[PDB]
Symmetry: C2
């Protein structure tokens, strides 16, 4: 039985009931939460917390409950994301080839906003430019679809004005890049801003005067 | 008492014998002896942490450390801004598998969850990871190469569009009971072994030629979920044949006016497209009445 991509709101509330029953009897959180009464597929506690977050977000934004609660974040099909990228930039099979094509064709532009519809950002990418958050969210699925491990790192970097800037880039491992056995903070830097703005090579952050780790993943403001 | 640290020469010697053991026995040793002919050993996961700190030190200072501390591995750290993903790359899946196998080897049991990344962050349940491994193995069989990605949760059709497309064929409906009734007066059943078909064409075949039980289950599951119910596809056997049993798929449905969701799913309401469209049996009854047994959950 495939672990489900989403479950009914009915099922989600039943999971919450079983979660609370376990806490009631045992005085602590369960490590996993079974999707259905009686056993079978289960999600980790981390994943269940993600599910509650999505329910909360939907309820806040829409003032009603969702019918459907996603177990993992909805995404367009990976082969399409890769094919659309290839349509724009040409053929590529490695993260190093992709970086080279990006460096020759894509542009960087700062803008807060964060809305990254792939088709939309694909066009802005080669015209006005995109920011590093849209860049990271556009390129992570393509590079994963080539077979690489990718993790979005939130950092502070110090630039040639000697000022610190918050910044996101990709940490990439697998194939020709860093060994996935390394800690993620030692994977290869794949930085859309190095490629399109500051002209630094694959492996180098966009600014060279200092780097500090802030966190993993993109902070979604609430 | 256990040693709290070793000097760099001792550590390089342990690392040498560790690598030799690996090449010789094709697995990591569960303990690493501080001296080759020696009593005291360091457990594998402590030793792997020693190596990691050693490599981090060289990477930072461009020189080897004078001392390597012996410290048991630490708890994971959470990552609230990372979600458990829909899929992982083959690179990450094989790293997950490498850590799952080492956990078994070291601890003699399976872990309850498997972290996507080493060190903490999002994780999948043991159950989900076993399902990932099975579908990975199946891909290796059908094709003759490793996949480039491995789904944590295989994609399911987006629900609002499925409901919209079904409503364009059957008209408005709001409950699973009402939908069954509409289906029983409009849709048609056709026996065929076409493993899937569900695109728009399936909805057209529904009301003209007919569809089979697997297409019907894959079509009506997301629609009924879209109406507010939980749905699980059951693989069963039902006594009709020549008169010696047939294999069959139907929907188990819970929520709203149908079965209590807190029941185990094999007590949920039977929603059988074949009952509605061919054998004329009511909602809650399988298509045949001498009715046989449970085979599994989901489309085989």
């Amino acid at each position: 039985e495939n672990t489900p991509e989403y479950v009914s709101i009915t099922q989600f509330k039943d999971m919450l009931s079983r979660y609370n029953r376990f806490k009631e009897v045992n005085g602590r959180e369960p490590r996993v939460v079974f999707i259905y009464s009686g056993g079978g597929p289960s999600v980790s506690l981390e994943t269940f917390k993600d599910m509650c977050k999505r329910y909360n977000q939907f309820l806040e934004e829409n003032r009603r409950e969702p019918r459907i609660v996603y177990v993992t974040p909805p995404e367009p099909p990976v082969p399409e994301e890769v094919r659309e990228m290839r349509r724009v930039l040409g053929e590529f099979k490695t993260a190093t080839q992709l970086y080279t094509l990006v460096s020759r064709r894509c542009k960087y532009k700062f803008y807060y906003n964060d809305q990254t519809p792939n088709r939309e950002a694909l066009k802005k990418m080669v015209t006005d430019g995109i920011n590093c958050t849209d860049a990271c969210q556009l390129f992570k699925p393509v590079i994963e679809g080539l077979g690489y491990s990718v993790r979005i790192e939130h950092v502070k970097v110090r630039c040639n004005d000697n000022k610190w800037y918050g910044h996101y880039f990709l940490r990439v491992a697998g194939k020709e890049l860093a060994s996935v056995s390394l800690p993620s903070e030692r994977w290869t830097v794949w930085d859309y801003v190095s490629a399109t703005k500051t002209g630094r090579p694959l492996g180098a952050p966009c600014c060279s005067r200092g780097i500090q780790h802030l966190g993993w993943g993109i902070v979604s403001p609430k």
